[PDB]
Amino acid sequence: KFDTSALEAFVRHIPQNYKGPGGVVAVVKDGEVVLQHAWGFADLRTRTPMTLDTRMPICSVSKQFTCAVLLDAVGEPELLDDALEAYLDKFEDERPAVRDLCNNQSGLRDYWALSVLCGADPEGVFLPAQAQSLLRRLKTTHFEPGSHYSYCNGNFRILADLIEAHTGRTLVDILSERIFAPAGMKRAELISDTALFDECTGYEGDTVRGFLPATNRIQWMGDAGICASLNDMIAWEQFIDATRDDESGLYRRLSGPQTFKDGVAAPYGFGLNLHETGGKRLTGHGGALRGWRCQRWHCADERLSTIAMFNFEGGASEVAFKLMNIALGVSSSEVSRVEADSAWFGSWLDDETGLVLSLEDAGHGRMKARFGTSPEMMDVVSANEARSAVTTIRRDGETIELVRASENLRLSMKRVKGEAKHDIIGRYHSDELDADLLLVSEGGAIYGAFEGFLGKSDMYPLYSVGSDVWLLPVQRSMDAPSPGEWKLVFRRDDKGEITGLSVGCWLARGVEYRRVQP
Amino acid sequence: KFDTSALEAFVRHIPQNYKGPGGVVAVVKDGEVVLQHAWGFADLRTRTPMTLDTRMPICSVSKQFTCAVLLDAVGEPELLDDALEAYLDKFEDERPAVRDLCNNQSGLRDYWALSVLCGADPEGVFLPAQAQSLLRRLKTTHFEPGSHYSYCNGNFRILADLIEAHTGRTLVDILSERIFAPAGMKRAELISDTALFDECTGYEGDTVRGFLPATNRIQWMGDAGICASLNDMIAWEQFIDATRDDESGLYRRLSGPQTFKDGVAAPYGFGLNLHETGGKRLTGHGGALRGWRCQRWHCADERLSTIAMFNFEGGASEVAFKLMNIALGVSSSEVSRVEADSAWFGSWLDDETGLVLSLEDAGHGRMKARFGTSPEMMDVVSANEARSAVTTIRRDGETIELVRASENLRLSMKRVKGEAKHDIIGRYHSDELDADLLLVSEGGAIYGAFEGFLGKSDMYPLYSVGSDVWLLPVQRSMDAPSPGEWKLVFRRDDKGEITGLSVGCWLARGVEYRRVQP
Missing domain, CATH: 2.40.128.50 (Lipocalin)
Known part of the structure; x- marks a missing residue:
């Protein structure tokens, strides 16, 4: 009998350590469910309890399912390289391979972070035609493909479009027929329009600020979109264990080692994070959206999986990781x-x-x-x-x-260092995005707004940290985590005149803007 | 020339140290405006700049104006003691004097904190008939009148009702005619319905969580309700300085020393906090509501006033205090x-x-x-x-x-100490409030809801800290600050059966509930 005493003691204290409305957790060992628990509420106002069959958006845990569809219904990523060339038809740099898209080594800047620069409202509607308009206008990369890793949701949103066009079928239908039915994921579904989902409510906030129901209206697929319950996610872990010895099995094909172009070991492959704890190799992935967090991890050597899904923004990834370490007896130390x-x-x-x-x-x-x-x-x-x-x-x-x-x-x-001059006010334009950044002074305090094809944003305060280097925090956006702080680095002439600036964050680096106004 | 160099250097850095959409500050010395500044936006989406004439709710800074009306239009508080007896007609304990209401030594529990226990929605409409229904059902105090200080908005909301009934006039009209006109506060107004105010938008949140527009729909008067601009508040400071030498002048009558019933010095009098910094006596008050913060301070010996008003939840009180210390040359130290x-x-x-x-x-x-x-x-x-x-x-x-x-x-x-038993679930009733507390278990995690004449609240998680002692945080409510954490202390029989519990917080202590269910 796999002893779950230490896991149960940890689970009993989750509500006090990870404060929020409700959640679900499970531990699967040797293909058997050894721990399965729901607590709290799916909705605090209607008082609907959280259950083991309550579906929630699994967000970025969907990426591994889109690579599984790719391998099952198309074949190796190289079969779509011609189609990628036609999709990114304005590309000016060397295009990444479709394989680089799958491994997050593409060099593309994240489109959800770029949507902020194009003027998107954080709670705005985002349609499939707007996704394509933004993805197909991209021309450059922020590093050479295969040289580095950066998390880019656009890689997987493009993949979904490539798969549907090559196959002539919908991702909704292929996932259902080729992945969910065989894995026994009875209620899992791709629900691309987040505004239609109402079976569980997600909450923004925390125990100090208070919790507020989240409203999400974006439409997505490939990078996210699957909605599933804890029991659905357990069936995926059991399918993984049942197919563990098949070298040509879908999960084994997604989860092997990867490297960068120089042979250095890479941390991601086919929609999965590749990690280790106490010398034991793990594969898995987390997901986030305003109001929601989840994570799955699997340790192949010990046939062990852990799952945590919350309808709030707390540490589901930390919970799933700690359950795994407790079940493996890994002493994490000081x-x-x-x-x-x-x-x-x-x-x-x-x-x-x-x-x-x-x-x-x-x-x-x-x-x-x-x-x-x-x-x-x-x-x-x-x-x-x-x-x-x-x-x-x-x-x-x-x-x-x-x-x-x-x-x-x-x-x-x-x-x-230095004191930042306030002559940075004016209007700046990004030729690649066709978007403007407007910077104004109100009483000596500088504020900025992003204006592009998705709309005109609210004004946001900027903070200087030294000469010509400013921070612009954006705390809420269509996707989660938000970009964090945009770093604005201004460039000047030999005369000391501003000609432009670099706008960037880790998800999208070095977006060049030229001064066009003030 | 009063040297404002150090004040100006501090003000220039306010937007970076006190992060938020916008604000206004002023310093008045010897009756002259020596510093007056607005920065940022009144509304980040419509991009309406903050100005020196932008009105905002001054919230609890209204209390001093209601005591000024009392002294000007009625006389000493003792003239209303008979009317207080008829208003609190169900009182079972010794009633506080009207003078104790003015000094926050009444012993009454705060009605905004009690509104949470009666099931109020944090963004709910709250009418004058509901205020009276809650205030007039009070029967007991949480300490003997005059023995201690506790901040109680009900003291001032009752005062407003007493003043209107004695005078046969509206507080709106009396403030306008007797206080705002003579003080030169040209646009100050009592706007009791917070849902009607839209000249400036207040924001909940902070630089890490993001800022969200606040919605407030409560109606109030006496404890709050005045809306005024920075220029209006400057005119009040100038009126104070112009009447500084009149021993029978309104502000001098509000701002003298007070004591508890045992002669120990008290910190509040007639709607004003009484404080000191570097040996210099200050009188003033702050105000808060979801989305808003403000503060005024005056130092009579140096004829100096400081004002700070923000449309967000940052440290306006800390700003006003620091300006005062800088202008007084007070070294605050380590x-x-x-x-x-x-x-x-x-x-x-x-x-x-x-x-x-x-x-x-x-x-x-x-x-x-x-x-x-x-x-x-x-x-x-x-x-x-x-x-x-x-x-x-x-x-x-x-x-x-x-x-x-x-x-x-x-x-x-x-x-x-100890482990808390989970047999506390069930329904509990407060006879004085006519309100219930419902406690349920969902997967082993305990949640509670407040149900009374204002509605049924959402479910809130509870956290145990030792045997029979639990915390129930409430982060957002009709008034600001919210109550913080309600402390639930359960009582048992000699058989170990729960008979009831005490529910309390600093604003409202020892509310007794009896077990009626489970």
């Missing part, structure tokens, strides 16, 4: 920290990429870093070295070296 | 801290009052305390002593002594 010198604090700029790192004290030998899409906590392990699980930074005087070895990324960043 | 022993952490219960203190590490010789309506940061100054600006705590083994000397409050609290 780092000795040192005091953070005050010389670390402030912002640091990479000239090559236009990205910025900002550091602040988070107490006890810890720093809060803002660099990627979400902030990360870093342990200060020595006078000049700090690290999170993904990023290491080393300081030498006025330079920081930042490394994210899993992305094949290494940056050299210089301390940003 | 406390040496010690490491917080782990024995402090957890929850502590006062048996007399039913209130709970919870402590957690906030880093560097600091603790986050949850006791009052909002959390407070405490400096650990010695092994067994910690303090905030308002509260001091001393630990001795399994007991903590908590003192809020400005409230005349001293509690002896014992560490709460």
Whole structure:
């Protein structure tokens, strides 16, 4: 009997440690459900309890299902390379291979982050014709295909379109016939229009701010769209275990090792994160949307899967990971920290990429870093070295070296200083997006708005961190996580006149804008 | 020339330190405006700039105007004591004097906190007939009148009703004729229905969560309701300075010293907070509602006033206070801290009052305390002593002594321990409010709802901190700050059966409920 005593003790305390309306969790071992539990409410106002058969959007956990459809109904990604050439018909750089789309090594900038720059409302309707209009206008990459990893939902949204055109069938129908029926996922469905989903309510907020029902109206497929219950997701884990020994089986074909073009090990393959804990290899994926979070993980050597799905923005990924470590008996352990010198604090700029790192004290030998899409906590392990699980930074005087070895990324960043001039106001234009950024002063405080084919955004405050380097936080958007902070790095003439600027974030780097107004 | 160089340098950095859509600030010295500034937007979507003439709700800054009306149009508070007896016609305890209402020493429980227990929706409509129905059903106090201080909006909402009935005139008209016209407050107005106000938009949220437009539909008067611009508020500060030498002048009559019934100095009088900074006496008040914050302070010895009004939930009170200290040249200074022993952490219960203190590490010789309506940061100054600006705590083994000397409050609290039994589910009834609390289990996690004459609330999660002691956070409500955490302390028989419980928070303590169901 697989002993679930420590798992049960952890699950019993989830509602107090991961505060929110409701959720579901499961642990599958050797193809058997050994732990399955629902708690709380699907809706706090109608008082509808959360159940094991309550469907929820699984969001980015859909990506692995779109690569499974690709392999099952089309074949290897190379069969769609000709069609990708016609889809990205205005491309000016070398196009990524369809295989690079599947592995998140494409170099394309994320279209949900770009939708903010095109003026999208965070709670706006987003149609299939607008997705294609934005994806098919892309011309450039932000790194050479195969050279680095970056998470790009557009890779999978394009894949869905390629699959439907090659096959002459809908992704809705192919998933149902080729994946959900054989796996025993009885109620799983691709529901592309998020405005139609009302079987469970998702909540934005947290225990301090309060919880608010989320409204989502985007339409998506390929990068997300599947809605399924805990029991549906359990059936997928059982299908995985039943087909574990078939070398030509769909999941085994999705989940092998991958590398970058230089042979360095990569962290993602065919819609799956590839990771390890205590020396044991894991494959899985998480998903997010305003109001929702979920995660699945599978350890092939121990025939073990863990699932967590919440109708709020709490740590479902952390829950699923901790259940896996508890079931594997992995002791996750303690780092000795040192005091953070005050010389670390402030912002640091990479000239090559236009990205910025900002550091602040988070107490006890810890720093809060803002660099990627979400902030990360870093342990200060020595006078000049700090690290999170993904990023290491080393300081030498006025330079920081930042490394994210899993992305094949290494940056050299210089301390940003000086007082920022307020002559940056005016209008700027991006030729590739056909979009404008308007910057105005109101009482000495600078605000900006994004104006493009999706609409005109609200005004957002900007914050300077040194001469000509400004941050523009965007906290809510059509997809989740939101982009975080856009980094604006202005460029000037030899006369000191502004000619343009770079706008970027980790999901979409170096978007060039030229000054056209003020 | 009063030198404003340090004030201007501070004001220039407000938008970066106090992040939000917009605001206004002013400094008045010797009756002259020496600093007046607006920044940002009144509405981020319509892009309407914030101006010096943009009106906003001043919320609880209205209380001083209702006591000014009382003194000007009625006379001393003792003239309304007979009418208070008829208004609180079901009172079972000794009624407070009308003077205790004015000084916040009444012992009445706050009606906005009680509206949550009666089932109010946080964004619900609240009419004058519902205010009277809730206020006139009150029967008991939570401390003897004059013995302690507690902030109670009901004191001022009752005062408004008493004034209108004695005078036969509307508070709208009396404020306009007797206060706003003579003070030169040209556009100030009592707009009791918050749903009608649309000249400026208030925003809930913060720079990390994002900002959301607030919807408020409550109707109020006496405790709040005045809407005014920065220029209106400047005219009130100038009127104060012009009448500073008249011993029988309205503001001088509102702003003298007060004491509790035992002669100890009290911190509030006639709708004004009474405080000091660097040895200089201040009088003033702040205001809050979802989406809005403001504060005014005046230092009579230096003929100095400071005002800050924001259309978001940031630190307007901290801004107004810091401007005052900068203008007075008060050096606010540093406390040496010690490491917080782990024995402090957890929850502590006062048996007399039913209130709970919870402590957690906030880093560097600091603790986050949850006791009052909002959390407070405490400096650990010695092994067994910690303090905030308002509260001091001393630990001795399994007991903590908590003192809020400005409230005349001293509690002896014992560490709460043990595992909480889940047999608390069932229905409970408050005879005085005619309201129920329903507690249910959903998958092992307990949730509660408040059901009374205002409606049936949504379900809210509860969190146990030790045997029979639970916390129920309520983060959003009709008034602001919300109550914070309700403290539920269950009572049992000699047989171990639950008979009832105490529900309370600092604004409304010891509301007794009896078990009626499960």
